[PDB]
Amino acid sequence: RDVTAVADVPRRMMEAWASNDASAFASLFAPDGTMVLPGDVFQKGVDGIREFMTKCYAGPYKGTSVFGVPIDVRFTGPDTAILITQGGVMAPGEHSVAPDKEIRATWVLGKRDGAWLVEAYHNSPVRL
Amino acid sequence: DVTAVADVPRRMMEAWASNDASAFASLFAPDGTMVLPGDVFQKGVDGIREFMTKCYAGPYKGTSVFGVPIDVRFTGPDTAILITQGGVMAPGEHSVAPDKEIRATWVLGKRDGAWLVEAYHNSPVR
C-alpha cells in the first residue's frame, strides 16, 4: 500500500510547519518543485522555497501551525498522485483554523527513488 | 508534446470566449479536478460542465480570459505541469483588473496521444 505513503506527505508538513522549520518544509518538494499561494507568491525550486519560508516563519507565520484532511486522493500514473486537502493556518494561541483563513490545496506528488515529493503545491481561500 | 502542452491553455481561452461550458469541461480528465477561490471544488467532467454552465450563463457571461504560461515543466514522459498568470476580463474592458488577476496551476496527463487537464487550481495575486 502506497496510498498511506501519499497521505503522509501532508502530515510530514504539519510537523515541519509546527517546528517552523523552513528547511524541513522545502525538503518536501521536488528539486524543481512549484508553490503558489494567495497574494504575490510564486516559488520554484527547493532553494527558492526555503528562502521564502525562512522569511515567512520569521515573520507573519511565526508560532503558526497547520492542519488539513485530504478530501480527494487519486493516482494518475504509477509515479504521480494528486491530492486535494482542506484546512488552513492556525494563529499562535488559537487551536482552530478561523473560517476566514480556511483553504483548499492541490498537491501534485511525484515518486522517485522509492519516495514521494511535492512536484507542485497550490492553495486558495474557501471564504470571501 | 511541447506545443500540445502549451496549446491546452489556449484551447480553453477559445472555449471560454465562446462561453462554451462543454468545450471547457472536455479539456479535463474523466476524474479531473478544479479548485477555485471561494467554496468551489468540482471533480469530474460532468461536475465541471454543470458548474461552468451556471457561470457562463451567470457572472462569467460575455467574459473572456487571457493567460501567460510563466512556467512549463515536465515531471515525466506522460505528465506535465503549467503555471499561468492572467485572469478573467470583463465585457467592455481590454485589460484584466489588478484585483482580478490570478495565477493557476495546470496539471496535464498524456493519454492516447492527447493531453487532458488532470488538475486546475488558481488563486488571486492581490
Total domain count, chain B? 1
- What is the DSSP pairing of strand B28-36 with strand B40-43? antiparallel
- Which three cell numbers, joined as nine digits, stand for B17? 470566449
Nearest to A41 by CA among B86, B82, B71, B103: B103
- Which three cell numbers, joined as nine digits, stand for B60? 462569467
3-state secondary structure B17-79: HCCCHHHHHCCEEEEEEEEECCCEEEECHHHHHHHHHHHHCCCCCCCEEEEEEEEEEECCCCE
Residues A77 and B89: their CA atoms lie apart, in Å, by 35
Q: Residue B121 and residue A123: Cβ atoms within 8 Å?
A: yes
Name the experimental technique. X-ray
Alpha-carbon distance values, A60 to B33, B37, B89 (Å): 31, 22, 32
Alpha-carbon distance values, B30 to B43, B46, B80, B101 (Å): 9, 9, 17, 28
Is B11 exposed, middle or buried, given 0-12, 13-18 or 19+ CB atoms closer than 10 A?
A: middle
| Contact (CB, 8 A) for B53 and B26 | no
Q: How many CB atoms lie within 10 A of CB A92?
A: 9
Sheet of A29-37: strands edge to edge?
A: A41-44, A29-37, A115-125, A102-112, A80-90, A65-75
| Cited resolution, angstroms | 2.7
Range of the domain at B15: 1-126
Residues A82 and A6: their CA atoms lie apart, in Å, by 9
Burial letters A33-54, b for 16+ CB under 10 A, else e: bbbbbbeeebbbbbebbbebbb
Residues of B in Cβ contact (< 8 Å) with A106: 33, 35, 105, 107, 119, 121
CA distance B29 to chain A (A): 10
Strand, coil or helix: A39: coil
List the end-to-end C-alpha distance of chain A, in Å, as a whole number: 38
Task: Inform me whether the C-beta atom of residue B118 falls under 8 Å from chain A C-beta atoms.
Answer: yes
Dihedral of CA A92/A64/A74/A100: which sign? positive
Residues A125 and B121: their CA atoms lie apart, in Å, by 11
* Chain center to CA of A47: 16
Task: Inform me whether the C-beta atom of residue A120 falls under 8 Å from chain B C-beta atoms.
Answer: yes
Q: How many CB atoms lie within 10 A of CB A94?
A: 10
Could you tell me the CATH number of the domain that includes residue B21? 3.10.450.50
